[PDB]
Design a protein around this ligand. Sequence first.
Ligand SMILES: *[C@@H]1O[C@H](CO[C@@H]2O[C@@H](C)[C@@H](O)[C@@H](O)[C@@H]2O)[C@@H](O[C@@H]2O[C@H](CO)[C@@H](O[C@H]3O[C@H](CO)[C@@H](O)[C@H](O)[C@@H]3O)[C@H](O)[C@H]2NC(C)=O)[C@H](O)[C@H]1NC(C)=O
Ligand code: NAG
Ligand code: NAG
Lengths: 117, 131, 106
Amino acid sequence: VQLVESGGGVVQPGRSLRLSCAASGFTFSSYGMHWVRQAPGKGLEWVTVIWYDGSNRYYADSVKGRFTISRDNSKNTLYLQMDSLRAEDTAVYYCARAVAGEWYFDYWGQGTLVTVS
Amino acid sequence: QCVNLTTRIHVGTKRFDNPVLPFYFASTEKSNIIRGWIFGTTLDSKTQSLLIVNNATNVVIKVCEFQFCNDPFLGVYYHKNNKSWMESEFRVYSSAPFLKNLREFITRFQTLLALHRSYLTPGDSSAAYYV
Amino acid sequence: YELTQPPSVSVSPGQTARITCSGDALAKHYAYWYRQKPGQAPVLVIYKDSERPSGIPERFSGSSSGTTVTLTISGVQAEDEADYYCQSADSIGSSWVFGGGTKLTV
Ligand SMILES: *[C@@H]1O[C@H](CO[C@@H]2O[C@@H](C)[C@@H](O)[C@@H](O)[C@@H]2O)[C@@H](O[C@@H]2O[C@H](CO)[C@@H](O[C@H]3O[C@H](CO)[C@@H](O)[C@H](O)[C@@H]3O)[C@H](O)[C@H]2NC(C)=O)[C@H](O)[C@H]1NC(C)=O
Ligand SMILES: *[C@@H]1O[C@H](CO)[C@@H](O)[C@H](O)[C@H]1NC(C)=O
Ligand SMILES: *[C@@H]1O[C@H](CO)[C@@H](O)[C@H](O)[C@H]1NC(C)=O
Protein backbone atom coordinates (compact mmCIF):
# COMPACT_ATOMS: atom_id res chain seq x y z
CA VAL A 1 0.00 0.00 0.00
CA GLN A 2 1.47 3.33 -1.18
CA LEU A 3 -0.15 6.76 -1.25
CA VAL A 4 1.56 9.62 -3.08
CA GLU A 5 0.38 13.23 -2.81
CA SER A 6 1.12 15.89 -5.42
CA GLY A 7 -0.11 19.27 -6.67
CA GLY A 8 0.90 21.30 -3.62
CA GLY A 9 2.27 24.82 -4.01
CA VAL A 10 1.97 28.48 -3.04
CA VAL A 11 -1.11 30.53 -3.91
CA GLN A 12 -2.71 33.85 -3.01
CA PRO A 13 -5.93 34.09 -0.95
CA GLY A 14 -8.97 33.76 -3.18
CA ARG A 15 -7.19 31.48 -5.65
CA SER A 16 -7.76 27.76 -6.13
CA LEU A 17 -5.42 24.77 -5.93
CA ARG A 18 -5.99 21.12 -6.83
CA LEU A 19 -4.33 18.26 -4.96
CA SER A 20 -3.97 14.68 -6.12
CA CYS A 21 -3.14 11.42 -4.32
CA ALA A 22 -2.12 8.43 -6.42
CA ALA A 23 -2.83 5.06 -4.85
CA SER A 24 -1.20 1.72 -5.52
CA GLY A 25 -0.77 -1.74 -3.99
CA PHE A 26 -4.45 -2.25 -3.18
CA THR A 27 -7.98 -2.34 -4.54
CA PHE A 28 -8.51 1.41 -4.50
CA SER A 29 -12.17 1.05 -5.49
CA SER A 30 -12.94 -0.81 -2.25
CA TYR A 31 -11.64 1.80 0.16
CA GLY A 32 -12.85 5.18 1.30
CA MET A 33 -10.34 8.01 1.39
CA HIS A 34 -9.69 10.94 3.70
CA TRP A 35 -7.83 14.20 3.62
CA VAL A 36 -6.27 15.46 6.84
CA ARG A 37 -4.37 18.70 7.19
CA GLN A 38 -1.81 19.88 9.69
CA ALA A 39 -0.80 23.51 9.98
CA PRO A 40 2.84 23.99 11.10
CA GLY A 41 3.05 23.85 14.89
CA LYS A 42 -0.55 22.61 15.11
CA GLY A 43 -2.32 19.27 15.53
CA LEU A 44 -4.20 17.14 13.01
CA GLU A 45 -7.44 18.45 11.55
CA TRP A 46 -9.73 16.22 9.51
CA VAL A 47 -10.82 17.87 6.28
CA THR A 48 -12.95 15.53 4.18
CA VAL A 49 -13.95 11.96 3.33
CA ILE A 50 -15.16 10.30 0.17
CA TRP A 51 -16.76 6.86 0.03
CA TYR A 52 -15.31 4.00 -1.99
CA ASP A 53 -17.76 4.56 -4.86
CA GLY A 54 -18.01 8.32 -4.47
CA SER A 55 -21.65 7.95 -3.42
CA ASN A 56 -21.12 10.06 -0.31
CA ARG A 57 -18.75 12.79 0.74
CA TYR A 58 -18.49 14.82 3.94
CA TYR A 59 -16.55 17.92 4.90
CA ALA A 60 -15.34 19.62 8.05
CA ASP A 61 -17.30 22.77 8.81
CA SER A 62 -14.17 24.88 8.34
CA VAL A 63 -13.94 23.96 4.65
CA LYS A 64 -17.59 23.31 3.91
CA GLY A 65 -18.79 24.87 0.67
CA ARG A 66 -15.25 25.62 -0.47
CA PHE A 67 -13.54 22.26 -0.86
CA THR A 68 -14.67 19.54 -3.25
CA ILE A 69 -13.55 15.92 -3.02
CA SER A 70 -13.69 13.50 -5.93
CA ARG A 71 -12.07 10.30 -7.12
CA ASP A 72 -11.42 8.41 -10.33
CA ASN A 73 -11.46 4.68 -9.63
CA SER A 74 -10.23 3.95 -13.15
CA LYS A 75 -7.01 5.85 -12.48
CA ASN A 76 -6.64 4.86 -8.83
CA THR A 77 -6.46 8.58 -8.09
CA LEU A 78 -7.97 10.73 -5.36
CA TYR A 79 -8.52 14.45 -5.94
CA LEU A 80 -9.16 17.48 -3.76
CA GLN A 81 -10.22 20.76 -5.31
CA MET A 82 -9.74 23.67 -2.96
CA ASP A 83 -11.50 26.85 -4.02
CA SER A 84 -11.43 30.27 -2.40
CA LEU A 85 -8.36 29.42 -0.32
CA ARG A 86 -7.59 31.57 2.71
CA ALA A 87 -4.45 32.14 4.78
CA GLU A 88 -5.91 29.88 7.47
CA ASP A 89 -5.74 26.95 5.04
CA THR A 90 -1.95 26.81 5.13
CA ALA A 91 -1.11 23.25 6.10
CA VAL A 92 0.43 19.96 5.11
CA TYR A 93 -2.28 17.96 3.41
CA TYR A 94 -2.19 14.20 3.82
CA CYS A 95 -4.27 11.60 2.03
CA ALA A 96 -5.18 8.58 4.11
CA ARG A 97 -6.97 5.32 3.56
CA ALA A 98 -9.95 4.42 5.68
CA VAL A 99 -9.61 1.07 7.37
CA ALA A 100 -12.17 -1.36 6.04
CA GLY A 101 -14.96 -2.00 8.53
CA GLU A 102 -13.77 0.60 11.06
CA TRP A 103 -13.45 4.34 11.82
CA TYR A 104 -9.68 4.87 11.90
CA PHE A 105 -7.05 5.62 9.27
CA ASP A 106 -4.56 2.83 8.65
CA TYR A 107 -2.37 3.97 5.77
CA TRP A 108 -1.10 7.50 5.26
CA GLY A 109 0.75 9.26 2.46
CA GLN A 110 3.70 11.60 2.98
CA GLY A 111 1.73 14.81 2.69
CA THR A 112 2.12 17.88 0.51
CA LEU A 113 2.50 21.44 1.77
CA VAL A 114 0.04 24.08 0.63
CA THR A 115 0.73 27.71 1.47
CA VAL A 116 -1.77 30.52 1.08
CA SER A 117 -0.36 34.08 1.14
CA GLN B 1 -28.77 15.80 5.64
CA CYS B 2 -29.24 12.61 3.56
CA VAL B 3 -27.00 9.60 2.94
CA ASN B 4 -26.80 7.69 -0.36
CA LEU B 5 -27.09 3.97 0.52
CA THR B 6 -28.67 2.27 -2.49
CA THR B 7 -26.17 0.11 -4.35
CA ARG B 8 -26.04 -1.05 -7.99
CA ILE B 9 -29.69 -4.07 4.86
CA HIS B 10 -27.18 -6.78 3.85
CA VAL B 11 -23.40 -7.26 4.25
CA GLY B 12 -18.56 -8.73 3.97
CA THR B 13 -19.52 -6.63 0.91
CA LYS B 14 -22.14 -3.94 1.54
CA ARG B 15 -25.49 -4.14 -0.20
CA PHE B 16 -28.54 -1.93 0.22
CA ASP B 17 -31.95 -2.11 -1.38
CA ASN B 18 -34.89 -0.59 0.46
CA PRO B 19 -37.15 0.39 -2.43
CA VAL B 20 -40.22 2.55 -2.54
CA LEU B 21 -43.20 0.26 -3.00
CA PRO B 22 -46.67 0.87 -4.50
CA PHE B 23 -49.68 1.20 -2.16
CA TYR B 24 -50.00 -6.25 4.32
CA PHE B 25 -46.68 -5.51 6.03
CA ALA B 26 -44.93 -7.93 8.37
CA SER B 27 -41.50 -8.48 9.87
CA THR B 28 -39.83 -11.18 11.95
CA GLU B 29 -36.89 -10.05 14.04
CA LYS B 30 -35.44 -9.82 17.54
CA SER B 31 -33.28 -6.78 16.83
CA ASN B 32 -36.02 -4.13 16.55
CA ILE B 33 -34.80 -3.01 13.13
CA ILE B 34 -38.12 -1.89 11.72
CA ARG B 35 -38.86 1.52 13.20
CA GLY B 36 -41.43 3.07 10.93
CA TRP B 37 -42.84 3.84 7.50
CA ILE B 38 -43.30 6.68 5.05
CA PHE B 39 -46.60 6.95 3.19
CA GLY B 40 -47.24 9.45 0.41
CA THR B 41 -47.22 10.13 -3.32
CA THR B 42 -44.24 12.13 -4.57
CA LEU B 43 -42.55 11.70 -1.19
CA ASP B 44 -41.11 15.21 -1.48
CA SER B 45 -41.91 18.77 -0.41
CA LYS B 46 -44.52 19.20 -3.15
CA THR B 47 -47.22 17.23 -1.33
CA GLN B 48 -48.19 16.12 2.16
CA SER B 49 -46.86 12.80 3.41
CA LEU B 50 -47.47 10.64 6.47
CA LEU B 51 -44.50 9.77 8.65
CA ILE B 52 -44.79 7.05 11.30
CA VAL B 53 -41.79 6.54 13.57
CA ASN B 54 -41.39 4.43 16.71
CA ASN B 55 -38.67 4.84 19.35
CA ALA B 56 -37.80 3.56 22.85
CA THR B 57 -40.51 5.44 24.74
CA ASN B 58 -43.22 6.49 22.28
CA VAL B 59 -44.48 6.67 18.70
CA VAL B 60 -44.72 9.86 16.69
CA ILE B 61 -47.00 10.36 13.71
CA LYS B 62 -46.86 13.49 11.57
CA VAL B 63 -48.35 14.79 8.34
CA CYS B 64 -46.26 17.42 6.59
CA GLU B 65 -44.74 18.53 3.31
CA PHE B 66 -41.65 16.46 4.06
CA GLN B 67 -38.62 16.44 1.83
CA PHE B 68 -37.55 12.84 2.23
CA CYS B 69 -34.16 11.25 1.60
CA ASN B 70 -33.85 8.63 -1.13
CA ASP B 71 -32.55 6.21 1.50
CA PRO B 72 -34.19 7.35 4.77
CA PHE B 73 -33.18 5.68 8.02
CA LEU B 74 -32.75 5.99 11.76
CA GLY B 75 -29.17 5.74 12.95
CA VAL B 76 -28.22 3.54 15.90
CA TYR B 77 -24.99 2.68 17.69
CA TYR B 78 -23.74 0.29 20.34
CA HIS B 79 -22.98 2.38 23.40
CA LYS B 80 -19.46 1.46 24.46
CA ASN B 81 -19.95 1.92 28.20
CA ASN B 82 -23.68 1.11 28.64
CA LYS B 83 -23.39 -2.01 26.39
CA SER B 84 -26.67 -1.42 24.58
CA TRP B 85 -28.03 -0.12 21.29
CA MET B 86 -29.14 3.51 21.25
CA GLU B 87 -30.52 5.99 18.74
CA SER B 88 -28.19 8.63 17.34
CA GLU B 89 -29.80 10.93 14.79
CA PHE B 90 -32.58 10.69 12.22
CA ARG B 91 -31.74 10.77 8.53
CA VAL B 92 -35.25 10.46 7.18
CA TYR B 93 -35.92 13.89 5.72
CA SER B 94 -34.00 17.08 5.03
CA SER B 95 -36.97 19.35 5.70
CA ALA B 96 -40.60 19.44 6.92
CA PRO B 97 -44.88 2.67 20.94
CA PHE B 98 -45.82 -0.52 19.03
CA LEU B 99 -42.41 -1.66 17.67
CA LYS B 100 -38.12 -14.61 16.38
CA ASN B 101 -41.10 -12.33 17.16
CA LEU B 102 -43.36 -11.70 14.18
CA ARG B 103 -44.92 -8.25 13.98
CA GLU B 104 -47.88 -8.02 11.61
CA PHE B 105 -49.59 -4.86 10.27
CA ILE B 106 -50.98 7.60 -0.59
CA THR B 107 -49.77 5.75 -3.72
CA ARG B 108 -46.30 4.76 -2.52
CA PHE B 109 -44.58 3.90 0.74
CA GLN B 110 -41.14 3.12 2.14
CA THR B 111 -39.92 1.22 5.20
CA LEU B 112 -37.74 2.90 7.82
CA LEU B 113 -35.03 0.67 9.26
CA ALA B 114 -32.57 1.15 12.11
CA LEU B 115 -29.14 1.27 10.55
CA HIS B 116 -26.02 0.45 12.55
CA ARG B 117 -23.34 3.12 12.24
CA SER B 118 -20.92 0.30 11.42
CA TYR B 119 -22.58 0.30 8.00
CA LEU B 120 -21.90 4.00 7.52
CA THR B 121 -18.16 3.56 7.24
CA PRO B 122 -16.72 4.90 3.93
CA GLY B 123 -15.39 1.48 2.86
CA ASP B 124 -17.27 -1.13 0.81
CA SER B 125 -17.36 -3.71 3.61
CA SER B 126 -18.47 -4.25 7.23
CA ALA B 127 -33.13 -6.80 8.30
CA ALA B 128 -35.92 -8.61 6.41
CA TYR B 129 -39.64 -8.04 5.95
CA TYR B 130 -42.66 -9.02 3.87
CA VAL B 131 -45.21 -6.94 1.93
CA TYR C 1 -17.85 15.49 19.73
CA GLU C 2 -14.77 17.54 20.76
CA LEU C 3 -11.73 15.75 22.15
CA THR C 4 -9.64 17.28 24.91
CA GLN C 5 -6.13 16.18 25.82
CA PRO C 6 -3.27 17.96 27.68
CA PRO C 7 -0.71 19.90 25.58
CA SER C 8 2.19 17.92 27.04
CA VAL C 9 3.38 15.11 29.30
CA SER C 10 6.82 14.94 30.92
CA VAL C 11 8.20 11.48 31.63
CA SER C 12 11.69 10.31 32.56
CA PRO C 13 13.14 7.42 30.49
CA GLY C 14 12.19 4.13 32.11
CA GLN C 15 8.97 5.53 33.58
CA THR C 16 5.38 5.02 32.45
CA ALA C 17 3.67 7.81 30.53
CA ARG C 18 -0.08 8.19 30.76
CA ILE C 19 -1.64 10.37 28.08
CA THR C 20 -5.32 11.04 28.60
CA CYS C 21 -8.13 12.24 26.32
CA SER C 22 -11.67 13.17 27.32
CA GLY C 23 -15.02 14.04 25.80
CA ASP C 24 -18.66 12.95 25.91
CA ALA C 25 -18.30 11.09 22.62
CA LEU C 26 -15.67 8.83 24.14
CA ALA C 27 -18.23 7.22 26.41
CA LYS C 28 -20.18 6.21 23.33
CA HIS C 29 -17.56 5.23 20.78
CA TYR C 30 -14.05 3.81 20.60
CA ALA C 31 -10.93 5.97 20.65
CA TYR C 32 -7.94 5.57 18.38
CA TRP C 33 -4.41 6.74 19.15
CA TYR C 34 -1.78 7.99 16.73
CA ARG C 35 1.91 8.70 17.14
CA GLN C 36 3.49 11.35 14.96
CA LYS C 37 7.18 12.13 14.72
CA PRO C 38 8.45 15.36 13.07
CA GLY C 39 8.53 15.10 9.28
CA GLN C 40 6.44 11.92 9.28
CA ALA C 41 2.79 10.97 8.79
CA PRO C 42 0.82 9.81 11.89
CA VAL C 43 1.13 6.12 12.75
CA LEU C 44 -1.66 4.16 14.41
CA VAL C 45 -0.61 2.88 17.83
CA ILE C 46 -3.87 1.81 19.48
CA TYR C 47 -7.34 1.09 18.13
CA LYS C 48 -10.61 0.20 19.81
CA ASP C 49 -9.23 1.75 23.02
CA SER C 50 -6.86 -1.12 23.87
CA GLU C 51 -5.82 -3.11 20.77
CA ARG C 52 -2.43 -2.94 19.04
CA PRO C 53 -1.45 -3.20 15.35
CA SER C 54 1.12 -5.89 14.56
CA GLY C 55 3.80 -3.21 14.17
CA ILE C 56 3.35 -1.89 17.71
CA PRO C 57 5.25 -3.40 20.71
CA GLU C 58 3.67 -4.58 23.97
CA ARG C 59 4.90 -1.46 25.77
CA PHE C 60 1.83 0.29 24.40
CA SER C 61 -1.52 -0.39 26.03
CA GLY C 62 -4.80 1.40 26.49
CA SER C 63 -7.78 1.63 28.81
CA SER C 64 -11.00 3.58 29.25
CA SER C 65 -13.41 4.76 31.92
CA GLY C 66 -16.48 6.95 31.48
CA THR C 67 -15.66 9.82 29.12
CA THR C 68 -11.90 9.42 29.45
CA VAL C 69 -9.50 7.21 27.53
CA THR C 70 -5.83 6.70 28.34
CA LEU C 71 -2.78 5.68 26.36
CA THR C 72 -0.23 4.02 28.61
CA ILE C 73 3.38 3.72 27.52
CA SER C 74 5.65 1.67 29.76
CA GLY C 75 9.43 1.59 29.68
CA VAL C 76 9.46 4.91 27.83
CA GLN C 77 12.51 5.40 25.62
CA ALA C 78 13.95 8.29 23.61
CA GLU C 79 12.26 6.90 20.50
CA ASP C 80 8.85 7.53 22.08
CA GLU C 81 9.33 11.30 22.11
CA ALA C 82 6.48 12.11 19.75
CA ASP C 83 3.14 13.89 19.44
CA TYR C 84 0.27 11.61 20.40
CA TYR C 85 -3.28 12.19 19.23
CA CYS C 86 -6.67 10.79 20.22
CA GLN C 87 -9.13 10.25 17.38
CA SER C 88 -12.80 9.37 17.09
CA ALA C 89 -15.82 9.73 14.81
CA ASP C 90 -19.40 10.85 15.31
CA SER C 91 -22.49 8.69 15.68
CA ILE C 92 -23.57 9.01 12.06
CA GLY C 93 -20.16 8.67 10.39
CA SER C 94 -20.22 12.15 8.86
CA SER C 95 -17.36 13.65 10.83
CA TRP C 96 -13.96 12.66 12.18
CA VAL C 97 -12.26 14.43 15.07
CA PHE C 98 -8.76 14.65 16.51
CA GLY C 99 -7.71 16.01 19.88
CA GLY C 100 -5.24 18.89 20.16
CA GLY C 101 -2.33 16.47 20.52
CA THR C 102 -0.02 15.74 23.43
CA LYS C 103 3.71 16.29 23.17
CA LEU C 104 5.45 13.59 25.16
CA THR C 105 8.83 14.70 26.45
CA VAL C 106 11.18 11.89 27.55
C1 LIG D 1 -26.12 11.99 -2.20
O1 LIG D 1 -26.29 12.04 -3.62
C2 LIG D 1 -26.73 13.36 -4.08
C3 LIG D 1 -26.95 13.26 -5.58
O2 LIG D 1 -25.74 12.97 -6.27
C4 LIG D 1 -25.99 12.78 -7.72
O3 LIG D 1 -26.79 11.61 -7.96
C5 LIG D 1 -26.13 10.38 -7.54
C6 LIG D 1 -27.08 9.23 -7.81
C7 LIG D 1 -24.79 10.20 -8.30
O4 LIG D 1 -25.00 10.08 -9.70
C8 LIG D 1 -23.90 11.42 -8.01
O5 LIG D 1 -22.65 11.29 -8.71
C9 LIG D 1 -24.63 12.70 -8.47
O6 LIG D 1 -23.84 13.84 -8.16
C10 LIG D 1 -25.68 14.43 -3.72
O7 LIG D 1 -26.17 15.73 -4.09
C11 LIG D 1 -25.51 16.30 -5.31
O8 LIG D 1 -24.26 16.94 -4.99
C12 LIG D 1 -23.59 17.49 -6.18
C13 LIG D 1 -22.26 18.07 -5.72
O9 LIG D 1 -21.40 17.07 -5.22
C14 LIG D 1 -24.47 18.56 -6.87
O10 LIG D 1 -23.77 19.01 -8.05
C15 LIG D 1 -24.32 20.28 -8.65
O11 LIG D 1 -24.52 21.30 -7.65
C16 LIG D 1 -23.28 21.76 -7.02
C17 LIG D 1 -23.65 22.82 -6.00
O12 LIG D 1 -24.49 22.29 -4.98
C18 LIG D 1 -22.32 22.33 -8.09
O13 LIG D 1 -21.10 22.73 -7.49
C19 LIG D 1 -22.04 21.22 -9.13
O14 LIG D 1 -21.15 21.72 -10.15
C20 LIG D 1 -23.37 20.78 -9.77
O15 LIG D 1 -23.97 21.86 -10.47
C21 LIG D 1 -25.82 17.88 -7.24
O16 LIG D 1 -26.72 18.81 -7.85
C22 LIG D 1 -26.49 17.33 -5.96
N1 LIG D 1 -27.74 16.68 -6.33
C23 LIG D 1 -28.82 16.81 -5.57
C24 LIG D 1 -30.10 16.14 -5.95
O17 LIG D 1 -28.78 17.49 -4.53
C25 LIG D 1 -25.50 14.41 -2.19
O18 LIG D 1 -24.51 15.38 -1.81
C26 LIG D 1 -25.03 13.01 -1.75
N2 LIG D 1 -24.92 12.96 -0.30
C27 LIG D 1 -23.72 13.00 0.26
C28 LIG D 1 -23.58 12.94 1.76
O19 LIG D 1 -22.71 13.07 -0.44
C1 NAG E 1 -39.59 9.45 21.08
O1 NAG E 1 -40.30 10.45 20.33
C2 NAG E 1 -40.98 11.44 21.19
C3 NAG E 1 -41.75 12.40 20.30
O2 NAG E 1 -40.90 13.05 19.37
C4 NAG E 1 -39.94 12.18 22.06
O3 NAG E 1 -40.60 13.09 22.93
C5 NAG E 1 -39.17 11.15 22.90
O4 NAG E 1 -38.18 11.81 23.69
C6 NAG E 1 -38.49 10.14 21.96
N1 NAG E 1 -37.82 9.11 22.76
C7 NAG E 1 -36.55 8.78 22.53
C8 NAG E 1 -35.88 7.73 23.36
O5 NAG E 1 -35.92 9.34 21.62
C1 NAG F 1 -25.98 4.28 31.25
O1 NAG F 1 -26.49 3.68 32.46
C2 NAG F 1 -26.65 4.63 33.57
C3 NAG F 1 -27.14 3.85 34.78
O2 NAG F 1 -28.40 3.24 34.55
C4 NAG F 1 -27.65 5.74 33.17
O3 NAG F 1 -27.77 6.70 34.22
C5 NAG F 1 -27.11 6.45 31.91
O4 NAG F 1 -28.03 7.47 31.51
C6 NAG F 1 -26.96 5.41 30.77
N1 NAG F 1 -26.38 6.07 29.59
C7 NAG F 1 -27.15 6.39 28.56
C8 NAG F 1 -26.56 7.06 27.37
O5 NAG F 1 -28.36 6.13 28.58
